[PDB]
Design an enzyme around this catalytic site. Structure first.
Site, short mmCIF file in Angstrom:
data_model
loop_
_atom_site.label_atom_id
_atom_site.label_comp_id
_atom_site.label_asym_id
_atom_site.label_seq_id
_atom_site.Cartn_x
_atom_site.Cartn_y
_atom_site.Cartn_z
N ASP A 21 -9.39 -4.92 -5.75
CA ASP A 21 -8.85 -3.98 -4.78
C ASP A 21 -9.54 -2.62 -4.91
O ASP A 21 -9.45 -1.97 -5.96
CB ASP A 21 -7.34 -3.85 -4.99
CG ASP A 21 -6.61 -3.16 -3.85
OD1 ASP A 21 -7.17 -2.17 -3.30
OD2 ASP A 21 -5.50 -3.62 -3.51
N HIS A 42 -7.59 -6.00 -0.89
CA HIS A 42 -6.42 -5.14 -0.82
C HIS A 42 -5.23 -5.82 -0.13
O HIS A 42 -4.15 -5.86 -0.71
CB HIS A 42 -6.76 -3.75 -0.28
CG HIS A 42 -5.55 -2.90 -0.09
ND1 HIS A 42 -4.91 -2.25 -1.14
CD2 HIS A 42 -4.85 -2.58 1.02
CE1 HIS A 42 -3.88 -1.58 -0.68
NE2 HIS A 42 -3.81 -1.77 0.64
N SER A 79 0.83 -1.20 0.00
CA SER A 79 0.00 0.00 0.00
C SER A 79 0.88 1.26 0.00
O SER A 79 1.78 1.38 -0.82
CB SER A 79 -0.96 -0.07 1.17
OG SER A 79 -2.17 0.61 0.88
C1 XOM Z 1 -8.96 8.55 -0.83
C2 XOM Z 1 -7.91 7.50 -0.88
C3 XOM Z 1 -8.27 6.16 -0.96
C4 XOM Z 1 -7.27 5.19 -1.00
C5 XOM Z 1 -5.93 5.55 -0.96
C6 XOM Z 1 -4.90 4.49 -1.01
O1 XOM Z 1 -5.33 3.41 -0.21
C7 XOM Z 1 -4.71 3.52 1.06
C8 XOM Z 1 -4.92 2.33 2.00
N1 XOM Z 1 -3.57 2.69 2.39
C9 XOM Z 1 -2.74 2.01 3.23
O2 XOM Z 1 -1.53 2.17 3.22
C10 XOM Z 1 -3.46 1.09 4.20
C11 XOM Z 1 -4.46 -0.03 3.79
C12 XOM Z 1 -3.86 -0.86 4.95
C13 XOM Z 1 -4.48 -0.88 6.34
O3 XOM Z 1 -3.79 -2.01 6.96
C14 XOM Z 1 -3.30 -2.86 5.98
O4 XOM Z 1 -2.70 -3.92 6.17
N2 XOM Z 1 -3.63 -2.28 4.77
C15 XOM Z 1 -2.55 -0.02 4.79
C16 XOM Z 1 -3.20 3.23 1.11
C17 XOM Z 1 -5.56 6.89 -0.87
C18 XOM Z 1 -6.57 7.85 -0.83
CL1 XOM Z 1 -6.16 9.51 -0.73
#
Ligand code: XOM
Length: 285
Positions: free
Chosen positions: A229, A259, A122
């Site tokens: 995802d 994800h 991520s």
């Molecule tokens: C609006 C918007 C939506 C989506 C993303 C991008 O998705 C983010 C999810 N993010 C992580 O780093 C966490 C997911 C998690 C939690 O715990 C884990 O093991 N996985 C690590 C990146 C950016 C923005 Cl601005």
């Protein structure tokens, strides 16, 4: 007679003097974890956790990695886990990159002439990309678990509109594996508070920087993406596949997966563990 200050403590009140730590450029303490093999390590690998989470979530991966006779090391990014800093706040996204480079620079000195790999998930994967692009030629290999290359359009536009007018994610989108969603929701080190606006603009900002760095990548890498995802669009992993120049590049799609691929349904997760094992093994033997 003057006296030393009361020891520095993690945000959960544990004295840093008691934990593996490093002080960063802004003088913030970072919590560190180390998995060291018996005998001489073949390589070094740094594990970069994602937004809201912390290094502890990578226990199993890191034990497999150390299994292959690598030295695994990790720290919690600032404003995460047992490291200092306001929860999910950073002055600039580049802090995470700089802080990784510092940890690697330290570890390289202590272990001269060893090749170094990166593993990120991520946001942690976006951090690994930028880390690699800043030092082309330096890393032996990069393992990416659904890295943040393109953000989900549905979600990004929602946030942009909300930000233009200035809530917590449904955690079910993490993983089809409901036990893992539950473990996530009951982990005290995680930050399950709604995404602050300043940090959210920063992540969309990192998306931009990641796209600029893509053409400069030459590092070998393995890229694991779920097709369904809803956080890091799978389209992002095709872009990485297309734009990077790396001579040694590989993509696995997991059909229907969400994800957190290392915490997904066992068929997926077992495959994820196996491929990482095979790939790192081939490039350290
Ligand atoms: C609006 C918007 C939506 C989506 C993303 C991008 O998705 C983010 C999810 N993010 C992580 O780093 C966490 C997911 C998690 C939690 O715990 C884990 O093991 N996985 C690590 C990146 C950016 C923005 Cl601005």
């Amino acid at each position: 007679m003057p006296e030393e200050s009361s020891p520095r403590r993690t945000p959960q009140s544990i004295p840093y003097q008691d934990l593996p730590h490093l002080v960063n450029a802004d003088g913030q303490y970072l919590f560190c974890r180390y998995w060291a093999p018996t005998g001489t390590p073949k390589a070094l690998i740094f594990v970069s956790h994602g937004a809201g989470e912390h290094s502890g979530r990578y226990e199993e991966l890191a034990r497999m990695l150390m299994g292959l006779d690598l030295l695994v090391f990790a720290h919690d990014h600032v404003g995460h886990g047992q490291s200092e800093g306001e929860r999910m706040v950073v002055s600039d996204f580049h802090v995470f990159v700089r802080d990784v480079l510092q940890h690697v620079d330290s570890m390289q000195k202590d272990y001269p002439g060893l090749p170094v790999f990166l593993l990120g998930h991520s946001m942690g994967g976006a951090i690994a990309i930028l880390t690699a692009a800043e030092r082309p030629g330096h890393f032996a290999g990069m393992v990416l678990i659904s890295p943040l290359v393109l953000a989900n359009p549905e979600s990004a536009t929602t946030f942009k509109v909300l930000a233009a007018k200035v809530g917590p994610i449904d955690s079910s989108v993490l993983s089809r594996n409901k036990t893992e969603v539950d473990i996530y929701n009951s982990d005290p080190l995680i930050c399950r508070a709604g995404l602050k606006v300043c940090f959210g603009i920063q992540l969309l900002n990192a998306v931009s920087r990641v796209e600029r760095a893509l053409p400069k990548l030459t590092v070998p890498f393995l890229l694991l993406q779920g097709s369904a995802d809803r956080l890091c669009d799978s389209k992002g992993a095709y872009l990485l596949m297309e734009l990077a120049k790396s001579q040694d590049k590989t993509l696995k799609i997991y059909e229907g997966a969400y994800h957190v691929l290392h915490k997904e349904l066992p068929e997926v997760t077992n495959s994820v563990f196996h491929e990482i094992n095979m790939w790192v093994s081939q490039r350290t033997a």
